Design a protein around this motif. Structure first.
Motif, short mmCIF file in Angstrom:
data_model
loop_
_atom_site.label_atom_id
_atom_site.label_comp_id
_atom_site.label_asym_id
_atom_site.label_seq_id
_atom_site.Cartn_x
_atom_site.Cartn_y
_atom_site.Cartn_z
N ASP A 114 0.83 -1.23 0.00
CA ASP A 114 0.00 0.00 0.00
C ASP A 114 0.85 1.27 0.00
OD1 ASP A 114 -1.96 -1.92 0.15
OD2 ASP A 114 -2.41 -1.55 2.27
N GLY A 115 1.97 1.26 0.72
CA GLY A 115 2.85 2.44 0.78
C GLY A 115 2.47 3.38 1.91
N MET A 116 3.18 4.50 2.03
CA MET A 116 2.93 5.48 3.12
C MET A 116 1.52 6.06 2.97
SD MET A 116 5.97 7.67 4.48
CE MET A 116 5.98 9.43 4.78
N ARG A 117 0.80 6.23 4.08
CA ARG A 117 -0.55 6.86 4.03
C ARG A 117 -0.37 8.37 4.20
NH1 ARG A 117 -3.35 2.43 3.53
NH2 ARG A 117 -5.23 3.71 3.25
N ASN A 118 -1.44 9.12 4.50
CA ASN A 118 -1.34 10.58 4.51
C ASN A 118 -1.14 11.15 5.91
OD1 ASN A 118 -1.27 13.14 3.53
ND2 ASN A 118 -3.29 13.07 2.56
N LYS A 119 -2.09 10.91 6.81
CA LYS A 119 -2.02 11.14 8.26
C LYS A 119 -1.72 12.57 8.70
CE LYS A 119 -2.82 6.91 9.42
NZ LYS A 119 -3.03 6.39 8.05
N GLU A 120 -2.31 13.56 8.02
CA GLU A 120 -2.15 15.00 8.41
C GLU A 120 -0.68 15.39 8.49
OE1 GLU A 120 -4.14 12.97 10.96
OE2 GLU A 120 -5.47 12.90 9.21
N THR A 121 -0.11 15.43 9.70
CA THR A 121 1.31 15.83 9.89
C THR A 121 2.25 14.94 9.07
OG1 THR A 121 3.07 15.47 11.49
CG2 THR A 121 0.88 14.73 12.14
N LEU A 122 3.22 15.54 8.37
CA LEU A 122 4.21 14.74 7.61
C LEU A 122 5.02 13.89 8.60
CD1 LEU A 122 6.37 14.04 5.46
CD2 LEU A 122 7.44 16.23 6.01
N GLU A 123 5.42 14.50 9.72
CA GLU A 123 6.22 13.76 10.72
C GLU A 123 5.36 12.60 11.20
OE1 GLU A 123 5.14 16.62 10.47
OE2 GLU A 123 6.64 18.20 10.76
N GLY A 124 4.07 12.86 11.44
CA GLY A 124 3.16 11.81 11.92
C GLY A 124 3.02 10.66 10.94
N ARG A 125 2.87 10.95 9.64
CA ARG A 125 2.80 9.85 8.63
C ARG A 125 4.12 9.07 8.59
NH1 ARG A 125 1.40 13.72 4.77
NH2 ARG A 125 3.14 14.71 3.68
N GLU A 126 5.26 9.75 8.65
CA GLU A 126 6.52 8.96 8.64
C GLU A 126 6.51 8.04 9.86
OE1 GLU A 126 9.15 12.26 8.96
OE2 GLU A 126 9.31 12.56 6.79
N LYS A 127 6.12 8.59 11.02
CA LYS A 127 6.19 7.78 12.26
C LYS A 127 5.27 6.58 12.10
CE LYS A 127 6.74 12.03 14.94
NZ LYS A 127 5.94 13.10 15.56
N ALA A 128 4.06 6.78 11.59
CA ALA A 128 3.09 5.67 11.50
C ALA A 128 3.66 4.60 10.57
CB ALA A 128 1.78 6.17 10.98
N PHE A 129 4.19 4.99 9.41
CA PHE A 129 4.65 3.93 8.49
C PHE A 129 5.79 3.16 9.16
CE2 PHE A 129 7.08 2.42 4.69
CZ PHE A 129 6.09 1.65 4.14
N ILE A 130 6.73 3.89 9.77
CA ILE A 130 7.91 3.17 10.34
C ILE A 130 7.42 2.23 11.43
CG2 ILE A 130 10.07 3.43 11.60
CD1 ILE A 130 10.35 6.20 10.24
#
Ligand SMILES: [Zn+2]
Lengths: 39, 267
Positions: B31-47
């Motif tokens: 699926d890849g990285m989602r959106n999740k408002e904050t850019l820092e927040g989306r990086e954190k969620a994917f990792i």
């Protein structure tokens, strides 16, 4: 004389013990009936 | 043996878990990285998700390896009847437990006499199990059977029955003379110690507690099952306060239905 009197004593005590057990069973039935009476 | 059954079913679920977790890793990466408002927040969620999936794969592989370390080693009509018999037996066990926990019977009314031979057969059947308990029946006074249950090097219990139903119990210590001068049972005595008077009181609550109305075999069997747990007197600590001694008493309360030690002050 001693042996005859011992045998009579043992007969009397066996009769009394069996009497006590039968009377106890009857008492159990009567206690259940009297205490569980509605009145 | 049953432990091989449980280890094999365990490792079956371990393989299914390993396969699904590997596929979950690759699906979440598809699926890849989602959106999740904050850019820092989306990086954190994917990792975080990727790391958790990898850790779950590692855990499943480790569990499979651990089970590997612990593993040990017309006809269809009979097997169908065998499976259906075990199914009916387990089904009936569950349904019987659920139904006798919640009975709707309110009264026996609508709209004791036993041969002593039957009592001896029942109590010898109980004495055959529990190899540390020896039960010695005698009848000094009529049909009311009197039982000496010795228990290890710990207890001597004098149980006085009445028509195959426990009536009175007296718990005395091992050395204590339970016999009178004439060698009969001392039905009326106490035990010179605080501990065994407490255990007489607990045994009287035990015979008041285990009361089925009709069938008395479950009553005597359950009373002996509860009594068997007292072999770990002076060795079990209390399950509330941890210690052994409250006011100089060992934990005298073996709780019904879960035989655990307590000081009776710790209920
Ligand atoms: Zn305690």
């Amino acid at each position: 004389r001693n042996q005859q009197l011992r045998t009579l004593q043992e007969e009397c005590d066996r009769k009394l013990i069996t009497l006590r057990d039968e009377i106890s069973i009857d008492l159990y039935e009567l206690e259940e009936e009297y205490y569980s009476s509605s009145s | 043996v049953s432990v091989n059954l449980e280890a094999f079913s365990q490792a079956i679920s371990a393989i299914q878990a390993l396969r699904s977790s590997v596929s979950r890793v690759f699906d979440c990466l598809k699926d890849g990285m989602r959106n999740k408002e904050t850019l820092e927040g989306r990086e954190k969620a994917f990792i975080a998700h990727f790391q958790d999936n990898l850790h779950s794969v590692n855990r499943d592989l480790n569990e499979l390896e651990r089970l590997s370390n612990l593993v040990g080693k017309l006809y269809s009509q009979l097997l169908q009847a065998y499976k259906w018999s075990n199914k009916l037996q387990y089904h009936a066990g569950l349904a019987s437990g659920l139904l006798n926990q919640q009975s709707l019977k309110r009264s026996a009314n609508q709209m004791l006499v036993l041969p002593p031979q039957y009592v001896d057969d029942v109590i010898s059947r109980i004495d055959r199990m529990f190899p540390e308990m020896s039960i010695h029946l005698s009848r000094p006074n009529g049909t009311s059977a009197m039982l000496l249950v010795t228990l290890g090097k710990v207890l001597k219990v004098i149980v006085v029955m009445r028509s195959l139903f426990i009536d009175r119990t007296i718990v005395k210590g091992y050395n204590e003379n339970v016999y009178t001068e004439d060698g009969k049972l001392d039905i009326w005595s106490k035990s010179n110690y605080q501990v065994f008077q407490k255990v007489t009181d607990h045994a009287t609550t035990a015979l008041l507690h285990y009361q089925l109305p009709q069938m008395p075999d479950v009553v005597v069997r359950s009373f002996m099952t509860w009594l068997r747990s007292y072999i770990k007197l002076f060795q079990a600590p209390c399950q509330r306060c941890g210690k052994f001694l409250q006011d100089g008493l060992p934990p005298t309360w073996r709780d019904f239905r879960t035989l655990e030690a307590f000081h009776d002050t710790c209920r």
